[PDB]
Design a protein around this nucleic acid. Structure first.
Ligand code: C2E
Ligand code: MG
Ligand code: MG
Ligand code: MG
Ligand code: MG
Length: 87
RNA sequence: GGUCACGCACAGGGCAAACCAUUCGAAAGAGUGGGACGCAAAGCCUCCGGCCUAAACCAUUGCACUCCGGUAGGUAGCGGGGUUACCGAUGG
């Protein structure tokens, strides 16, 4: 189940792309090295985020310590992602 | 001369990009004033395609690393199409 990238769900869809990036970057940065944060506001990608950590241990700590977290008045739903391509 | 085209001019000229000031706007962008990159319809119109914006509303819980909700607004100086018009190369 565990993975380098975490998949963040049920996000407030009214927050702009670049404010959400910055807000996620300042929150999850303490858990470990963040490679990139994937956020877009298209129909299929609304309310969603992919936070990529350099190591799984930091991602597991990120997933468990902040699951169900109140974020812009919405519960954060964290599960693992399936395949981190990029490069 | 008319009409429909056309732009090698002539002639009166017309408009105004970027930038700046200011107003409106959530934004894209628009108005007004200065200002000219250009423009033979760079006059006018969102009917079709593209591009740009996302405040409100409706819809959407969606696994991405081409891009993509409806809607609403915008660009006519992004094309196409519609419409109106000045000059007239011994002009076609
Ligand atoms: N009266 C008239 N004359 C025409 C027309 N078409 C061509 N000409 C003549 O041909 C010249 C070159 O035209 P252009 O290559 O379209 O190049 C033009 C054009 O791009 C632009 N321009 C000038 N006036 C206008 C205008 O009222 N509307 C537009 N869209 N462009 C203009 O400036 C350039 C130079 O203009 P000019 O010194 O007048 O010089 C013009 C003019 O003498 C027309 O429909 N009516
Ligand atoms: Mg002249
Ligand atoms: Mg002016
Ligand atoms: Mg003409
Ligand atoms: Mg308009």
């Amino acid at each position: 189940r565990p993975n380098h990238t975490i998949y963040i769900n049920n996000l407030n869809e009214k927050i702009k792309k670049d404010e959400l990036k910055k807000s996620l970057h300042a929150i999850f940065s303490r858990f470990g090295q963040i490679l990139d944060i994937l956020v877009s506001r298209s129909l299929k990608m609304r309310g969603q985020a992919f936070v990529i950590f350099k190591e799984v241990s930091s991602a597991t700590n990120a997933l468990r310590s902040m699951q169900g977290f109140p974020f812009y008045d919405k519960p954060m739903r964290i599960q693992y992602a399936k395949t981190d391509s990029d490069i």
